[PDB]
Coordinates of C-alpha atoms and ligand atoms in Angstrom, one line a residue:
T2 CA -73.1 -82.7 -46.6
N3 CA -74.4 -86.8 -48.2
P4 CA -73.0 -89.5 -46.6
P5 CA -71.3 -92.5 -48.1
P6 CA -73.3 -94.3 -50.0
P7 CA -73.9 -97.5 -48.9
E8 CA -71.2 -100.8 -49.6
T9 CA -71.6 -102.3 -52.7
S10 CA -68.6 -104.7 -51.6
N11 CA -66.9 -106.1 -48.7
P12 CA -64.0 -108.0 -49.0
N13 CA -64.8 -110.3 -45.6
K14 CA -68.5 -110.4 -46.2
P15 CA -69.4 -114.0 -47.7
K16 CA -70.3 -114.3 -51.8
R17 CA -73.0 -116.3 -53.2
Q18 CA -75.0 -116.7 -56.6
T19 CA -78.4 -119.0 -55.7
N20 CA -80.6 -119.4 -58.7
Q21 CA -82.8 -116.6 -56.7
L22 CA -80.3 -113.7 -56.1
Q23 CA -79.8 -114.7 -60.3
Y24 CA -83.0 -113.9 -60.6
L25 CA -83.2 -111.2 -58.9
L26 CA -81.1 -109.5 -61.2
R27 CA -81.7 -110.6 -64.2
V28 CA -85.9 -110.6 -64.2
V29 CA -86.8 -108.5 -60.6
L30 CA -84.3 -105.9 -60.7
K31 CA -83.9 -105.4 -64.8
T32 CA -87.8 -105.2 -65.0
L33 CA -87.9 -101.9 -62.4
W34 CA -85.2 -100.6 -64.0
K35 CA -86.3 -100.4 -67.2
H36 CA -89.6 -98.7 -66.1
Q37 CA -90.6 -95.5 -66.9
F38 CA -91.0 -94.4 -62.5
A39 CA -87.6 -95.8 -62.1
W40 CA -85.3 -92.8 -62.6
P41 CA -85.5 -91.5 -58.8
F42 CA -84.2 -95.0 -57.4
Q43 CA -81.5 -95.6 -59.9
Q44 CA -79.1 -93.4 -57.7
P45 CA -78.9 -92.5 -53.9
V46 CA -80.7 -89.8 -52.6
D47 CA -78.6 -86.8 -53.2
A48 CA -79.6 -84.2 -50.6
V49 CA -77.3 -81.2 -51.7
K50 CA -78.5 -81.6 -54.8
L51 CA -82.0 -82.0 -54.2
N52 CA -82.3 -79.0 -51.3
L53 CA -83.6 -81.7 -48.6
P54 CA -81.2 -80.8 -45.0
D55 CA -83.3 -83.3 -43.3
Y56 CA -83.3 -86.1 -45.3
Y57 CA -80.2 -88.3 -43.6
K58 CA -81.5 -87.0 -40.7
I59 CA -84.4 -89.0 -40.8
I60 CA -83.6 -91.5 -43.1
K61 CA -80.9 -93.3 -41.6
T62 CA -81.0 -96.4 -43.2
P63 CA -80.7 -95.4 -47.2
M64 CA -81.1 -97.8 -50.0
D65 CA -82.1 -96.9 -53.7
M66 CA -81.7 -99.4 -56.8
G67 CA -78.4 -98.7 -57.9
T68 CA -76.4 -99.8 -55.1
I69 CA -79.3 -103.3 -55.2
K70 CA -78.3 -103.7 -58.9
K71 CA -73.7 -103.6 -58.1
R72 CA -74.4 -105.6 -55.4
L73 CA -76.2 -108.0 -57.7
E74 CA -73.6 -107.9 -60.2
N75 CA -70.5 -108.4 -57.4
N76 CA -72.5 -111.3 -55.4
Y77 CA -72.6 -109.2 -52.6
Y78 CA -75.5 -111.3 -50.8
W79 CA -75.8 -114.3 -49.5
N80 CA -79.6 -114.7 -50.0
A81 CA -82.2 -113.5 -51.9
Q82 CA -83.6 -112.6 -48.4
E83 CA -80.9 -109.6 -48.2
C84 CA -81.8 -108.1 -51.3
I85 CA -85.5 -108.3 -50.5
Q86 CA -84.5 -106.4 -47.6
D87 CA -83.2 -104.0 -49.8
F88 CA -86.2 -103.3 -51.9
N89 CA -88.0 -103.2 -49.1
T90 CA -86.1 -100.4 -47.2
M91 CA -86.0 -98.5 -50.5
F92 CA -89.1 -98.2 -50.9
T93 CA -90.4 -97.6 -47.4
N94 CA -87.6 -94.8 -46.9
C95 CA -89.9 -92.9 -49.9
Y96 CA -92.9 -93.7 -47.6
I97 CA -91.3 -92.1 -44.3
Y98 CA -89.8 -89.5 -45.4
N99 CA -92.9 -88.1 -47.9
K100 CA -96.1 -88.3 -48.2
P101 CA -99.5 -89.9 -48.9
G102 CA -100.5 -88.6 -52.8
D103 CA -96.9 -86.9 -53.6
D104 CA -95.9 -87.9 -57.0
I105 CA -92.8 -89.9 -55.7
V106 CA -94.6 -92.0 -53.5
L107 CA -97.6 -92.7 -56.0
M108 CA -94.8 -93.7 -58.7
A109 CA -92.9 -96.0 -55.4
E110 CA -96.3 -97.8 -55.1
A111 CA -96.5 -98.4 -58.8
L112 CA -93.0 -99.8 -59.0
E113 CA -93.4 -101.7 -55.6
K114 CA -96.8 -103.1 -57.1
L115 CA -94.6 -104.5 -60.0
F116 CA -92.4 -106.1 -57.8
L117 CA -93.9 -108.0 -55.9
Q118 CA -95.7 -109.6 -58.7
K119 CA -92.3 -110.9 -59.8
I120 CA -91.5 -111.7 -56.4
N121 CA -94.0 -113.9 -55.6
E122 CA -92.7 -115.7 -58.8
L123 CA -88.8 -116.2 -57.7
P124 CA -87.9 -120.2 -58.6
Ligands
LIG1 C1 -88.5 -87.1 -57.6 C2 -88.4 -86.9 -56.2 N1 -87.7 -87.3 -55.6 C3 -87.6 -86.8 -54.0 C4 -88.0 -85.4 -53.9 C5 -87.9 -84.6 -52.5 C6 -87.7 -85.6 -51.7 C7 -87.7 -87.4 -51.4 C8 -87.2 -87.5 -53.2 C9 -87.2 -89.0 -52.8 O1 -87.7 -89.5 -52.1 N2 -86.5 -89.9 -54.2 C10 -86.4 -91.5 -53.9 C11 -85.9 -89.0 -54.7 C12 -84.5 -89.8 -55.4 N3 -84.2 -89.4 -56.1 C13 -84.4 -88.4 -57.3 N4 -83.8 -87.8 -58.4 C14 -83.6 -86.6 -59.4 C15 -85.1 -85.7 -58.8 C16 -85.4 -84.8 -60.4 C17 -84.3 -85.4 -61.4 C18 -84.8 -84.0 -62.0 O2 -84.6 -82.7 -62.1 N5 -85.0 -84.8 -63.3 C19 -85.5 -83.5 -64.3 C20 -86.7 -83.4 -65.0 C21 -87.7 -84.9 -65.2 N6 -89.6 -85.6 -65.3 C22 -89.5 -86.3 -65.4 C23 -91.0 -86.1 -65.8 N7 -91.9 -85.4 -66.5 C24 -93.4 -84.9 -66.2 C25 -91.0 -84.4 -65.9 C26 -89.7 -83.7 -66.0 C27 -87.5 -86.2 -63.9 C28 -85.5 -85.9 -63.9 C29 -83.4 -86.3 -61.6 C30 -83.6 -86.9 -59.8 O3 -82.1 -87.8 -60.5 C31 -81.7 -88.6 -61.6 N8 -85.5 -87.4 -56.9 C32 -86.4 -88.0 -55.8

């Protein structure tokens, strides 16, 4: 019922660790990960356990911080833009599937505000 999760390693994808990617893991990801509202975003949406039979009919580019964390740890990304895009996709999916005022949308907005503050200080 769930799709395979996004890959976190790919032996054919060139790997890199720039100073910006280092900041993305050690400052940006870590700051969001320890936030009180991180828990919905620390693993893929489990549409089986959450009883969301239409989630992966609507969301075709799933992303979550657990995936992002592993990608960063594995040096999966070539540049910071790829990682920033993954964060943006995660938030966007939440806004697509849910509705204004839903608790989960308010949590995403709080996390996104923090993300934006930290990205503004990228090396
Ligand atoms: C969260 C809402 N939601 C969605 C729901 C419907 C549709 C889309 C989404 C969605 O867009 N996203 C990103 C989500 C991604 N992932 C999850 N995962 C999880 C959801 C619930 C639990 C859970 O039952 N508990 C137990 C209760 C606990 N409460 C703490 C707050 N306290 C006041 C009261 C107790 C929180 C954890 C655990 C989860 O995973 C660890 N839910 C998501």
